[PDB]
Curated annotation (Swiss-Prot), chains A, B:
Assembly and binders: Heteromer of multiple flagellin subunits including FlaA, FlaB, FlaC, FlaD and FlaE.
Subcellular location: Secreted; Bacterial flagellum
Family, as annotated: Belongs to the bacterial flagellin family.
Main function: Flagellin is the subunit protein which polymerizes to form the filaments of bacterial flagella. FlaB is not essential for flagellar synthesis and motility.
Gene name in the database record: flaB
Full-protein residues shown: 55 to 108 of 376
Protein name per UniProt: Flagellin B
Misc. remarks from the entry: V.cholerae is able to differentially regulate the flagellins within the flagellum maybe to produce flagella which are particularly suited for motility within a given environment.
Length: 54, 54
């Protein structure tokens, strides 16, 4: 009986762990998209056609 | 006839002794349930998803 209640609280606890990892990874996805955009801009600036203004 | 009355006292004493055991068991049934509830609450609290407030 104690094991059954503990197992349910453990399943709920593991759901919380999946939730925390899900939220942080989802925010991490936009970090990846930002960095790729920053890398595209950095490559563009390296072109010799750009003057100091661009 | 002397100890026939004695057994009548004996069964009477045994009956109330059974009653004392029964009420002790009955109040005990709630004690077990309270401890089990505290075990689930403590189990939930051990999760790192909970902050200090929870």
């Amino acid at each position: 009986t104690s094991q059954s209640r503990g197992l349910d609280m453990a399943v709920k606890n593991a759901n919380d762990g999946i939730s925390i990892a899900q939220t942080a990874e989802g925010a991490m996805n936009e970090t990846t998209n930002i960095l790729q955009r920053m890398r595209d801009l950095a490559l563009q600036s390296s072109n010799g056609s750009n003057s100091s203004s661009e």
